[PDB]
Amino acid sequence: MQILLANPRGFCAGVDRAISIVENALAIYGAPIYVRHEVVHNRYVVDSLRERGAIFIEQISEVPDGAILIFSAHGVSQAVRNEAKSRDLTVFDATCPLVTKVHMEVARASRRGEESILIGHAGHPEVEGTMGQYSNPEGGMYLVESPDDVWKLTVKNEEKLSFMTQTTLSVDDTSDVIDALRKRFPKIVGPRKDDICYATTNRQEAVRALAEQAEVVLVVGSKNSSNSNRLAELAQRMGKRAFLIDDAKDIQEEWVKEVKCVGVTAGASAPDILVQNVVARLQQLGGGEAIPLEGREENIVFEVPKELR
Ligand SMILES: C=C=CCOP(=O)(O)OP(=O)(O)O
Numbered sequence: 001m002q003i004l005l006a007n008p009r010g011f012c013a014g015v016d017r018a019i020s021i022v023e024n025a026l027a028i029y030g031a032p033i034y035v036r037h038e039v040v041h042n043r044y045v046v047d048s049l050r051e052r053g054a055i056f057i058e059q060i061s062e063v064p065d066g067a068i069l070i071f072s073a074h075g076v077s078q079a080v081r082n083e084a085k086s087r088d089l090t091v092f093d094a095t096c097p098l099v100t101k102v103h104m105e106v107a108r109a110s111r112r113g114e115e116s117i118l119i120g121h122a123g124h125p126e127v128e129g130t131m132g133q134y135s136n137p138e139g140g141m142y143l144v145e146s147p148d149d150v151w152k153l154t155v156k157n158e159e160k161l162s163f164m165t166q167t168t169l170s171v172d173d174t175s176d177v178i179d180a181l182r183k184r185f186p187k188i189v190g191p192r193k194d195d196i197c198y199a200t201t202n203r204q205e206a207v208r209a210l211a212e213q214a215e216v217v218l219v220v221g222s223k224n225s226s227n228s229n230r231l232a233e234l235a236q237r238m239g240k241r242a243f244l245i246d247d248a249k250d251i252q253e254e255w256v257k258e259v260k261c262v263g264v265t266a267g268a269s270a271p272d273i274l275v276q277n278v279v280a281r282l283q284q285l286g287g288g289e290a291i292p293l294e295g296r297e298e299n300i301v302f303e304v305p306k307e308l309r
């Protein structure tokens with residue numbers, strides 16, 4: 001069996017920064033460090049950090065007075081930020097810069113009282129945070145997930161309307177939503193293409209190339225990682241069996257019995273040690289040396305704040 005590895009795969013710049021923020025806080029201040037939400041959506045990274053003294057909460061009401069609190073990479077609403085700010089808390093913000101860029105635009109639209117539409121998945125923490133930048137009652141902030149959502153939406157003033165997207169969507173399904181938004185609201189303003197980040201766009205491009213060669217694709221990533229689920233979905237829609245797995249223990253032998261080419265990739269929040277263990281398990285099941293595919297180069301790094309060096 002041939003093993004092919006997608007390139008790029010695995011950690012993006014926002015995930016490597018966010019995890020460094022928590023580890024550096026642990027190293028500078030000791031346990032416990034409180035973290036609002038999973039720092040990133042990966043069970044191995046979160047379990048790692050829990051065992052070293054990070055405590056992951058959903059609500060600021062779970063954090064004690066005087067504590068150090070870190071917001072996760074996905075961002076937080078103004079309400080959450082204000083709630084932390086009103087409490088005794090020392091706050092470090094691990095929001096990815098590419099989520100913050102979208103937040104600044106929604107805040108701008110809110111100040112102007114002009115309505116905004118976000119394309120994204122209901123209940124995802126990034127969507128809560130981004131919708132949570134809009135507060136002006138005179139405007140409006142609306143969520144759409146699909147063309148049908150667009151076809152049902154009514155707004156107050158379609159001459160003054162803008163749109164934004166979540167960072168970790170399907171490039172192709174988002175393009176379909178934007179085509180619908182422009183047909184329904186021809187004066188709508190947005191970015192040139194979408195707010196999907198370089199890491200999401202690149203990993204989807206890489207998994208497309210992987211699935212063109214592989215019969216079965218394994219995507220290393222947790223169930224609640226949006227971007228990881230998009231990579232599995234992309235390969236499934238190409239007619240390949242594709243599985244989202246957290247680690248090598250999840251691989252079922254039947255998925256690769258008599259398969260001649262298996263592809264492996266990883267979402268933006270999955271560490272490379274998990275992909276190494278997956279390759280080791282595929283080699284127990286008959287695979288050879290893993291062959292990395294040629295891929296688009298990534299060169300972006302985001303530094304931790306100087307306070308946490
Ligand atoms: C912040 C961030 C994204 C990094 O990956 P993630 O933590 O898996 O988040 P989503 O893909 O669910 O958005």
Ligand code: SF4
Nearest residue numbers: 012014096098167197
């Ligand atoms: S997936 Fe993109 S927006 Fe999200 S943390 Fe990574 S680089 Fe930032």
